[PDB]
Motif scaffolding. Structure first.
Motif, short mmCIF file in Angstrom:
data_model
loop_
_atom_site.label_atom_id
_atom_site.label_comp_id
_atom_site.label_asym_id
_atom_site.label_seq_id
_atom_site.Cartn_x
_atom_site.Cartn_y
_atom_site.Cartn_z
N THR D 116 7.05 -3.36 3.48
CA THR D 116 6.66 -4.11 2.29
C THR D 116 6.59 -5.60 2.58
OG1 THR D 116 7.63 -2.42 0.85
CG2 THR D 116 7.27 -4.61 -0.08
N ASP D 176 3.01 2.13 -2.18
CA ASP D 176 4.18 2.55 -1.42
C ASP D 176 4.64 3.95 -1.81
OD1 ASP D 176 5.15 2.05 -3.93
OD2 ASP D 176 6.71 0.64 -3.31
N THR D 218 2.34 2.65 2.34
CA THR D 218 3.57 2.75 3.12
C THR D 218 4.26 4.06 2.82
OG1 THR D 218 5.09 1.73 1.54
CG2 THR D 218 3.78 0.25 2.90
MG LIG Z 1 8.04 -0.12 0.40
#
Ligand SMILES: [Mg+2]
Ligand SMILES: Nc1ncnc2c1ncn2[C@@H]1O[C@H](COP(=O)(O)OP(=O)(O)OP(=O)(O)O)[C@@H](O)[C@H]1O
Ligand SMILES: Nc1ncnc2c1ncn2[C@@H]1O[C@H](COP(=O)(O)OP(=O)(O)OP(=O)(O)O)[C@@H](O)[C@H]1O
Ligand SMILES: Nc1ncnc2c1ncn2[C@@H]1O[C@H](COP(=O)(O)OP(=O)(O)OP(=O)(O)O)[C@@H](O)[C@H]1O
Ligand SMILES: [Mg+2]
Ligand SMILES: [Mg+2]
Lengths: 527, 186, 95, 252
Positions: D116, D176, D218
């Motif tokens: 991140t 994510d 991610t």
């Molecule tokens: Mg993340």
């Protein structure tokens, strides 16, 4: 009152059917009686506008020339022969009859084979309007049917909006990912797709907002799905399903060097002379990195090579990049597929089988070994993450091996008394299917007699309890795997003769092939 | 109904693409074995549209759909083998089963697992369901009793180890309809 | 005449045709326009939807198709109260 | 009446495509025929507000200098060679082709390796707008595709919310925990380049062009992503750190 004249001016160019004309007249009178500010006036005006804008009885100037249509189809996609033949047949039929026609097709196959884009190419070739209706993950049936005018913000639905937007009554509708339709709580969209895709009832498809049947009998519906069995049977029965098979490495090389590399060069801006991707480099990359049936990872590898070359050139490290098979690993990284055959020479207890896998074919070796020193009764232990069907196949193979060895060599009590252990290597990978029955029988017999099988022989096929060899699926992938692994002789069930000879010529050139009805033929071949 | 309608839709006169009764019978028995009709209509439409494409492109002016060349229009046959055994060896008996794609037949196969012919045992394979395995046990018990009463000196079923298999091991099957077939096989 | 009309459109659906002929006979014994409720169920592609129009032609009745597959709105069946702005009486009354 | 001018003035700086301008001006003509207190007026007002707030043709002025971007990247993170090389290649291709471009990257690795944070640093280095999109635990497709305008409440989905917030057609979107999703079929349309350029939302009813959006997903484990979704993304591995690298990171 002028809005009535506007509606008349918009209708009179259209071939409006009788019932639609009656409804339009009734709503025109109702609007005339109403004032200019009541909410009912606004609802009626919006409804009459929706009725007006729909293209009644007008069609796009569909192309009927076979040669230019074939050229247009060939401009974008390679090797999709079934779809191209279907489109050419559609054009020929539309040419024999005097008017345009509509059909309901469904392209299904593994991901990355080109089902979505071939729809666009077909729409361009037919000169029809194109719309992509992605029903994947959708659960709201109101997208297909809409709501009545009583509701505050009702709209007709996706299909009627397609007709309004394209301004033609015979567009091309791509119902993308029909197999991923959502069986949600807000109705069942597939149940509405049943009537939307009904070959007979398309002529009277009724939208909730319009409350007037619309003739969709000339709309060409194309559906795309990765898996067939999840589509409901009533819906699956209406569609004409045709399979888009995967691409062999020979086809993938042509696809790459003819379409992917030029498009990737155009995207990256590199010239042909600045960075050259030779044919041998592409062949090596496909062999060692792109064993899958799709073409969406070969494209990523080509883009990776070209972008690395572009960064090399622009940073000033070099004026040009020379990609070679030796230094390809510096661009693409570690090879993924390196070893294709576990045993170069087979010890007595092992037999080389064939298997179907997603990333092309594969070859499996059935390993057997004695477990206790002395050759009460014998027993068999099986390992290798075999499924239930594979375990049943192993048990049947053991029974038939016992019977066959007793009948052929009565003095050999190896299979009757000895404790056998059977294993299939790559123990982490689960495997299922009855395709390995004859392989297991041959492994047990070779272990019992202490004789290795022919050094380059591969076999597949289900075995019954009495020794009959039954047909098996996945002939293409198994044949490709056998050819890849240096197999010179392949044994197949006799009922797979049609499936084997339907393969392309270049896939079966170098293979000696024996077709067997009973296991004794396989025994004579192997020893 | 279907052939005239498909001809009208595709615009082919009867003289341009002949479809005889025998080729239709072969097409039905090889490809259209379900209970519905839509698939038969689609097969007929495929044949007529392929003939139409042959006519339009100048390849030929008349198309004859012989039973031999129907594969060129439709492809691989879907059903080719009707029965697995032309003549039954001693250990097998022919049975019948219900299937969605019309009727189907199954063969019950039995063979010895150990050479000598302590108590006997029965091993059941073939992806049989619980009901059919239970029927196999019932059949084994009744066969033991029946061979005890019919021929007292026959100790085969009492002591021998027997393996019973139903071919097409990948196809799951269930139901007690095969009890008498299993008894007769034993 | 009804049997001839039924035969010329569909083949072999003997049970449905016999039911329609019995319906006609009952409607003929007593001089009234009898109305009943029938459900046709079976495997897809046998001729359930299509036979409806042939039956309507044989009976010389008006025909209307109302597909409820995937429908979730009761207002299609029952309509709305006329207080609302755009209330309509539903599908049956419009039929 | 002034609300029509308020909606019109938003399109002066934008470059509205033809198929969007037709919808915009047909709703403009429709709006004049409705009284203010009517609910249809309210829904048309909301629809016009959403259509006119989308940054049609607004692109953030990216920096294409490799030296400056590299200096920014080393300034924030240590030793993530693969991601830095990928971003340098992205910038090189963008500079060579002379126009902005979009890609679908997937940084996957053990937790705590800085996925991140490196995504935020990439957004800062490329001078693109940044937006978090937490798909972990999401279960309703309405978050991505929204609902029809007919319902009392309506959303244009989270992607159109991002487009409105960032005021650019080429932001950096962080998606994510794609491996902890409940649903996924809506993401295929969002990030399939054959249809990414014409992403259609159920509220807007008009396709937007997301081909310039840089999607950075991610994940922690790669096998849980569905195969069709895994096929459209470029898997980039971020490895764990040895004791020496952890010492260097801690010191610096
Ligand atoms: Mg993340
Ligand atoms: N035969 C082919 N010739 C040229 N390009 C091809 C061919 N097959 C696939 N491609 C390319 O590979 C990509 C596949 O994308 P596409 O969406 O068409 O695939 P798909 O299999 O239909 O996908 P999905 O089923 O997941 O929606 C596209 O870039 C397409 O142009
Ligand atoms: N007995 C028959 N004779 C002639 N044509 C028939 C017969 N049965 C069906 N058909 C034709 O086959 C097709 C079946 O369409 P139909 O609408 O009747 O399907 P259905 O059996 O109601 O199926 P579904 O459950 O999918 O709605 C139509 O073209 C119909 O004309
Ligand atoms: N190479 C590095 N240099 C400097 N700091 C780093 C580096 N790698 C990780 N960090 C730091 O470690 C922490 C990791 O936080 P972050 O949320 O980025 O991790 P993550 O692995 O992406 O998380 P998750 O899997 O939970 O989404 C941050 O404080 C980040 O600054
Ligand atoms: Mg697609
Ligand atoms: Mg029906």
């Amino acid at each position: 009152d002028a809005i009535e004249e506007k509606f008349r001016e918009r209708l009179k160019e259209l071939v409006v059917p009788k019932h639609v004309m009656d409804v339009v007249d009734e709503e025109l009178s109702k609007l005339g009686l109403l004032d200019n500010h009541s909410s009912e006036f606004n609802v009626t005006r919006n409804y009459l506008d929706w009725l007006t804008s729909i293209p009644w009885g007008k069609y796009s100037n569909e192309n009927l020339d076979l040669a230019r249509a074939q050229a247009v189809l060939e401009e974008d996609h390679y090797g999709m022969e079934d779809v191209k033949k279907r489109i050419l047949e559609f054009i020929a039929v539309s040419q024999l009859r005097g008017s345009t026609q509509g059909k309901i097709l469904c392209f299904y196959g593994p991901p990355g084979v080109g089902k979505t884009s071939i729809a666009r190419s077909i729409a361009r070739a037919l000169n029809r309007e194109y719309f992509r209706f992605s029903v994947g993950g959708m659960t709201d049936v109101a997208e297909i049917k809409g709501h009545r005018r009583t509701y505050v913000g009702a709209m007709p639905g996706k299909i009627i909006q397609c007709l309004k937007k394209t301004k033609t009554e015979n567009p091309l509708i791509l119902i993308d990912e029909v197999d991923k339709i959502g069986r949600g709580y807000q109705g069942d969209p597939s149940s509405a797709l049943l009537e939307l895709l009904d070959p007979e009832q398309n002529a009277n498809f009724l939208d909730h907002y319009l409350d007037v049947p619309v003739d969709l009998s000339k709309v060409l519906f194309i559906c795309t799905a990765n898996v067939t069995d999840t589509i409901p049977e009533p819906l699956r029965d209406r569609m004409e399903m045709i399979n888009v098979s995967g691409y062999v490495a020979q086809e993938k090389l042509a696809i790459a060097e003819r379409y992917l590399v030029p498009q990737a060069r155009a995207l990256c801006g590199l010239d042909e002379s600045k960075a050259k991707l030779s044919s041998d480099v592409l062949t090596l990359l496909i062999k060692q990195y792109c064993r899958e049936s799709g073409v969406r990872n070969l494209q990523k590898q080509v883009e990776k090579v070209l972008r690395k070359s572009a960064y090399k050139i622009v940073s000033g490290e070099a004026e040009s990049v020379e990609v070679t098979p030796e230094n390809l690993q510096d661009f693409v990284g570690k090879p993924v597929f390196t070893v294709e055959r576990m045993y170069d020479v087979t010890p007595p207890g092992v037999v080389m089988g064939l298997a179907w896998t997603a990333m092309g074919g594969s070859t499996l070796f059935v390993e057997t070994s004695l477990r206790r020193p002395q050759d009460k009764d014998g027993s068999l232990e099986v390992t290798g993450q075999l499924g239930e069907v594979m375990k049943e196949s192993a048990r049947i193979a053991y029974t038939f091996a016992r019977a066959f060895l007793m009948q052929h060599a009565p003095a050999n009590d190896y299979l009757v008394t000895s404790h056998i252990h059977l294993h299939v290597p790559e123990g982490a990978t689960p495997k299922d299917g009855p395709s390995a029955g004859c392989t297991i029988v041959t492994a047990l017999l070779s272990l019992a007699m202490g004789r290795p099988v022919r050094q380059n022989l591969a076999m597949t096929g289900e075995v019954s309890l009495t020794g009959k060899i039954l047909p098996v699926g996945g002939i293409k992938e198994k044949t490709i795997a056998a050819k890849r692994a240096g197999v010179t002789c392949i044994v197949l069930p006799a009922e797979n003769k049609k499936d084997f000879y339907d393969l392309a010529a270049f896939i079966t050139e170098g293979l000696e092939v024996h077709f067997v009805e009973h296991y004794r033929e396989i025994f004579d071949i192997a020893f």
